Amino acid sequence: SSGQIVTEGNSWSDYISQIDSISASIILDTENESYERRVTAKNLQDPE
Amino acid sequence: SSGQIVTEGNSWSDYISQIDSISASIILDTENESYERRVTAKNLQDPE
Amino acid sequence: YYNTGTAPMYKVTPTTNLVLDGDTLSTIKAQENQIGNNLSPGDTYPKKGLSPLALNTMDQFSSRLIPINYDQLKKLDAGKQIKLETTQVSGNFGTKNSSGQIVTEGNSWSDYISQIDSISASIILDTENESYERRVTAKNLQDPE
Amino acid sequence: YYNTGTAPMYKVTPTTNLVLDGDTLSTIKAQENQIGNNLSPGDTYPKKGLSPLALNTMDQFSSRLIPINYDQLKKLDAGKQIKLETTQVSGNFGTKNSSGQIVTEGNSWSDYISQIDSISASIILDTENESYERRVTAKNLQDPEDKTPELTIGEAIEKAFGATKKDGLLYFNDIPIDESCVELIFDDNTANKIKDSLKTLSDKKIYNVKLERGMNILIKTPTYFTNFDDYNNYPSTWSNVNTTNQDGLQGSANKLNGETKIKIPMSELKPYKRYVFSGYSKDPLTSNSIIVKIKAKEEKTDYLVPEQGYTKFSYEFETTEKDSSNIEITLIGSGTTY
Amino acid sequence: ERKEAERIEQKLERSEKEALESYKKDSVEISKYSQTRNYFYDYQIEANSREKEYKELRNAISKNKIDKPMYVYYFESPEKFAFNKVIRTENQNEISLEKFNEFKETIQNKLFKQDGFKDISLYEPGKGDEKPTPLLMHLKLPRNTGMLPYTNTNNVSTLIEQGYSIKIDKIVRIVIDGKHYIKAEASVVSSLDFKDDVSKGDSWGKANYNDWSNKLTPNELADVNDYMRGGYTAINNYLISNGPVNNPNPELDSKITNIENALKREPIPTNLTVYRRSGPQEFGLTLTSPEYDFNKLENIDAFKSKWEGQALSYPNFISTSIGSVNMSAFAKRKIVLRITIPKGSPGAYLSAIPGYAGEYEVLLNHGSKFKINKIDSYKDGTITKLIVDATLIP
Amino acid sequence: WEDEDLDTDNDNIPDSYERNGYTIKDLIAVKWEDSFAEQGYKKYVSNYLESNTAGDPYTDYEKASGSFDKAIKTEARDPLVAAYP
Amino acid sequence: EDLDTDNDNIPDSYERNGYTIKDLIAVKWEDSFAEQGYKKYVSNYLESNTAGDPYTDYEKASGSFDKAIKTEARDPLVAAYP
Amino acid sequence: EDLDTDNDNIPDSYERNGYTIKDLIAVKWEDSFA
Numbered sequence A, B: 001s002s003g004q005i006v007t008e009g010n011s012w013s014d015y016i017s018q019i020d021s022i023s024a025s026i027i028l029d030t031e032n033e034s035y036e037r038r039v040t041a042k043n044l045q046d047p048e
Numbered sequence C: 001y002y003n004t005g006t007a008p009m010y011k012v013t014p015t016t017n018l019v020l021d022g023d024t025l026s027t028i029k030a031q032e033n034q035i036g037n038n039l040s041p042g043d044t045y046p047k048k049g050l051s052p053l054a055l056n057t058m059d060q061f062s063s064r065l066i067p068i069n070y071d072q073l074k075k076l077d078a079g080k081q082i083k084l085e086t087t088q089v090s091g092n093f094g095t096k097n098s099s100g101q102i103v104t105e106g107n108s109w110s111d112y113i114s115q116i117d118s119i120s121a122s123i124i125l126d127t128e129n130e131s132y133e134r135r136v137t138a139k140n141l142q143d144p145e
Numbered sequence D: 001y002y003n004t005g006t007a008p009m010y011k012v013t014p015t016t017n018l019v020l021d022g023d024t025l026s027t028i029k030a031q032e033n034q035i036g037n038n039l040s041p042g043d044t045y046p047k048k049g050l051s052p053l054a055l056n057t058m059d060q061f062s063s064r065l066i067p068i069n070y071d072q073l074k075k076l077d078a079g080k081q082i083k084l085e086t087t088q089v090s091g092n093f094g095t096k097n098s099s100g101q102i103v104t105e106g107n108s109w110s111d112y113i114s115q116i117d118s119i120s121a122s123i124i125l126d127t128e129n130e131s132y133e134r135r136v137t138a139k140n141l142q143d144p145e146d147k148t149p150e151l152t153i154g155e156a157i158e159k160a161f162g163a164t165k166k167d168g169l170l171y172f173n174d175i176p177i178d179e180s181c182v183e184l185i186f187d188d189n190t191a192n193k194i195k196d197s198l199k200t201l202s203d204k205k206i207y208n209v210k211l212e213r214g215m216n217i218l219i220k221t222p223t224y225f226t227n228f229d230d231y232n233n234y235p236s237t238w239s240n241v242n243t244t245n246q247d248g249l250q251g252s253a254n255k256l257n258g259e260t261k262i263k264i265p266m267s268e269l270k271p272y273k274r275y276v277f278s279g280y281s282k283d284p285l286t287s288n289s290i291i292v293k294i295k296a297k298e299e300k301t302d303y304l305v306p307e308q309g310y311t312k313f314s315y316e317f318e319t320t321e322k323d324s325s326n327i328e329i330t331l332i333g334s335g336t337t338y
Numbered sequence E: 001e002r003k004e005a006e007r008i009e010q011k012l013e014r015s016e017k018e019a020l021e022s023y024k025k026d027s028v029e030i031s032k033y034s035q036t037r038n039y040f041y042d043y044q045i046e047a048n049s050r051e052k053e054y055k056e057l058r059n060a061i062s063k064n065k066i067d068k069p070m071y072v073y074y075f076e077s078p079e080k081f082a083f084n085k086v087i088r089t090e091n092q093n094e095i096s097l098e099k100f101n102e103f104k105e106t107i108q109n110k111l112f113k114q115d116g117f118k119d120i121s122l123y124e125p126g127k128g129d130e131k132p133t134p135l136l137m138h139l140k141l142p143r144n145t146g147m148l149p150y151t152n153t154n155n156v157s158t159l160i161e162q163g164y165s166i167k168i169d170k171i172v173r174i175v176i177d178g179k180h181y182i183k184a185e186a187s188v189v190s191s192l193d194f195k196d197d198v199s200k201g202d203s204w205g206k207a208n209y210n211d212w213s214n215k216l217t218p219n220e221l222a223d224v225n226d227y228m229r230g231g232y233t234a235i236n237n238y239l240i241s242n243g244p245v246n247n248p249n250p251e252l253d254s255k256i257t258n259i260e261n262a263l264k265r266e267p268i269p270t271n272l273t274v275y276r277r278s279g280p281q282e283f284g285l286t287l288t289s290p291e292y293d294f295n296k297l298e299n300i301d302a303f304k305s306k307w308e309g310q311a312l313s314y315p316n317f318i319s320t321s322i323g324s325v326n327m328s329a330f331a332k333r334k335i336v337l338r339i340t341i342p343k344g345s346p347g348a349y350l351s352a353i354p355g356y357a358g359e360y361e362v363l364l365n366h367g368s369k370f371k372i373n374k375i376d377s378y379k380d381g382t383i384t385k386l387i388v389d390a391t392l393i394p
Numbered sequence F: 001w002e003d004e005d006l007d008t009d010n011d012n013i014p015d016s017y018e019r020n021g022y023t024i025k026d027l028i029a030v031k032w033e034d035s036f037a038e039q040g041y042k043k044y045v046s047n048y049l050e051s052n053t054a055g056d057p058y059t060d061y062e063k064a065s066g067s068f069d070k071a072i073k074t075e076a077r078d079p080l081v082a083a084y085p
Numbered sequence G: 001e002d003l004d005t006d007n008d009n010i011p012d013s014y015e016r017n018g019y020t021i022k023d024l025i026a027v028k029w030e031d032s033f034a035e036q037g038y039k040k041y042v043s044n045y046l047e048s049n050t051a052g053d054p055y056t057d058y059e060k061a062s063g064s065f066d067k068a069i070k071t072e073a074r075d076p077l078v079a080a081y082p
Numbered sequence H: 001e002d003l004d005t006d007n008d009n010i011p012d013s014y015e016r017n018g019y020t021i022k023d024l025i026a027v028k029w030e031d032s033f034a
């Protein structure tokens, strides 16, 4: 909240699997540019 | 505590022996995929 | 590696001797390539059904092979064998931290080896399939306390 | 590695010298391959029944062998030997937590070695096949604010080696270690202090001298000893003894008209080692001398003139045979001495 | 666990950083201010130079919590467990069997509450730790409690704020490095309390007791309102004068029975603490009595000696104020009663209904029994007022 | 002193239980009654002046109650036998 | 009295005149104790570590150190030293 | 009742007889929940 940013010890590999497990991958491929996105999807098997 | 995920200092070898000591091994071998599970089994000689 | 006690060992790092006739050719502490992560009582590293591990490096970073003399090579080529003697083994035990997770870093059996061996009696049971080693605490009759 | 102290050492990392004639070829500090995890007092790493470890690397990561020159190789093959000396040993001690959680990392003995040596006296007991070394704290008289308790040499030995007092005399396990039943070896400073304190002392016994800092006392138990009272270690038998009176240091005379003979079969002595034959001789009244004959390698003759009290002669001999006939010592000379 | 501390200190902004820095060098005085804070007027609690410190320290402590109950350990003075004696002095080693016996009998069934910042640890007090008192208590914190560890120059210690009452089951004698200590096991009791949350207390009262009158016939509601509006100084005096024994009569017995039934109709769903500014005449003391003068220490000591651990009872209708701030109508009274109301106990909020029903007024059954746990005092200007930790007994 | 609530070594087992005999049920030390044997309970005794009778890193209560690594043999659960590889 | 200047949990008079350890508590020495295997200890009452080793006088006397240390190093005047 | 011996936020009776998680708080099992 004071504007300090720390990146040491904050690894993306701890979140890659969790993100990919509950997301749906959507890609937009336009001319000379591409985008990759992940959108959270509901699991209907789980009532909670 | 903050909702973050940490993987440094969390080793599976600390739990491998304990899991293997109190569990049973069940393997399901279907086509093009195999599943290995450990299910905890009760010790009858221990009243506690 | 094999275990015959009552407790498991983590990060098993033994030290061994190589003796030809009366010469200790080298003593090597296990490097990263020869460390067993788990070793349960009655188990074996590598597990039963797997091939033995190769011990062929002597330096800290596993980059220096184990050399022998020309005369020692002549002794080997005449039929003499090399014996292996384990002098000591390093390892860890698991406790629970403040949150209740099992931790093995910082816990060492070498801290307790001397204390256990000083106040105990050693009993070995030898059966055909396997043998068991135990330590049972004995009382010092000369100490009223 | 071996330990003769009272406390174990964890992670034993000694530094050694290699000397050929007058050169120090190298000084290697032990790497991970040559570190002993546990070393209990009286034990040995590697444990008894295991081959010695190999020390053949000199760098920090055990990747460089120990080289020598052409001249040193010629010296080595000429028959000259390389000696080894230990200069220091690094190790750890274990602090016990209230729950019994032993921790040894970060607990160095080198932080206490100098302080312990500064305020203590070293006492060594050199028995057969086993030795012990202790440090006993001593008081400093120059400082009035030092309140450590005072101990004499006898009390210091009794506390340091766990000696047992039977009748005022100290026994280690079943061996007498009283000052008259052993050999006391001091350095020059301790000898000067003992002599300057005995003349001031009243009872005139070494064990009653107050212990002081820097003293170096070495106690050696005898191979064979006789007091003619309750202890006989000699393998053979003396030719003629006399034990019918309360004389000597303790109730023993062993003197008559005849002369004493002993023949050690030499099968129970060291092959090439140098020995000393000691004792106490007394005459109530001034009399003749004593003809002491020793025959181990060459027969040496010495003349002994005793006094009103008891004195030690400690006549000295040499054996270099391991196969020859018996060892002959005689104490010719009569006149009702003790 | 300095790794976790450095992970959790970065998320603290500058204000929490300065609060913790001020705490680290002045822990004792900030804590001493923290126990006695909410009993002053509505003005002092906003015009001090440390109120912001207390607020931001509470914010920092409640920023991070614990997901499961875990044990904590610390040294507590026996003076906070209703023991005015000393068990074993600093230079002595062993404790007497007798002193153990009175110490155990003094805390048989008595709940004690703490309301200040304090330093606790998650480990047994091994070597390298200082030992203020011969008392040792192993405390069991529940789920979701304030937990903000901080680090010193070399070591790490934790800080929490207490808003609960703790009960000790058993005490034993233990030996730590050659000295005798008393080991107590205690648990944390959940409840609800509003030290200064006027808005939150009002919201809770209106949320619970808005539907209170919907179950009552209009005649009984009108009777209750009329009785609390016009005859509050009549029926209470009649009950105090021992009416049923001296002059039995049904015209007031009907009122007593109706009010008792209405108050017993609805018990609380959750434990709360109510504050009654008791008058000296209630304890049978008068403003001219030397024992009443609480300015001196000896009168406080005597009142504690003769009234701590004793029983109390209120033959009148009990009126309590949920607020902890000093009120104009009850300014001159030195004794504030800290009644702890456990679940299933009688009590109804009377401020949910419209109109000016009083000052957070709450009515309970007449003749109710009270248990006194501890008696402590604070500086109030020049005078010292009095707090009693009353307990409601069925 | 004469009562059954002394914990001189501070390991959650009273001195009398350690001297005479005890067992663990519901993670609480209780007196040993001989009828417990037919139910499969084991009778334990241990040093009441030492928190680790056998010298291993686990206390007498931890060993007796089985509040340690599940991979350790059940023989090492009584305080007189050391958990030792 | 109950004075303890070095804070090693042994009273000054006890250290000065003699003491023994029983039930983890320092008590005065009596002549009848020596027949039961007890030992009489005297130590510096102005130093917590009389012998200069990493163990205090109470720790040495009580035996609350490593069990592998020799028994003769349990008195405060003989140092535990490898 | 309200007894939690192992301190894992689930009461002992629920663990013995069966439970389920709704809104991150454990509740008694009922055959309708299946």
Ligand SMILES: [Ca+2]
Binding pocket: D227, D228, D229, D248, D249, D250, D251, D252
């Ligand atoms: Ca004699």
Ligand SMILES: [Ca+2]
Binding pocket: F006, F007, F008, F009, F010, F011, F012, F013, F014, F015, F018, F048
């Ligand atoms: Ca106990």
Ligand SMILES: [Ca+2]
Binding pocket: F009, F011, F013, F018, F046, F047, F048, F049, F050, F051, F052, F053, F060
């Ligand atoms: Ca115990």
Ligand SMILES: [Ca+2]
Binding pocket: G003, G004, G005, G006, G007, G008, G009, G010, G011, G012, G015, G045
């Ligand atoms: Ca002292």
Ligand SMILES: [Ca+2]
Binding pocket: G006, G008, G010, G015, G043, G044, G045, G046, G047, G048, G049, G050, G057
């Ligand atoms: Ca001292």
Ligand SMILES: [Ca+2]
Binding pocket: H003, H004, H005, H006, H007, H008, H009, H010, H011, H012, H015
């Ligand atoms: Ca549970």
